[PDB]
């Protein structure tokens, strides 16, 4: 995530595309809502964006 080609976003939007499915252009908007910490912002996707809510059904 270091290339001649990164960017201080790509550090954790690299990141977040890697544990989540979605599209790098809603990763940078789900970080620009959370001072860019990958710790507190996939949390915001998995209580928005997740795909499932049980695991007794």
Do not use: M
């Amino acid at each position: 995530i270091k290339r001649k080609d990164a960017s201080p976003e790509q550090e954790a939007i690299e990141s977040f595309t890697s544990l989540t499915k979605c599209d790098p252009k809603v990763s940078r908007k789900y970080l620009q809502r959370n001072h860019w910490n990958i710790n507190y912002a996939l949390n915001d996707y998995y209580d928005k964006e997740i795909g499932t809510f049980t695991d007794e059904v």
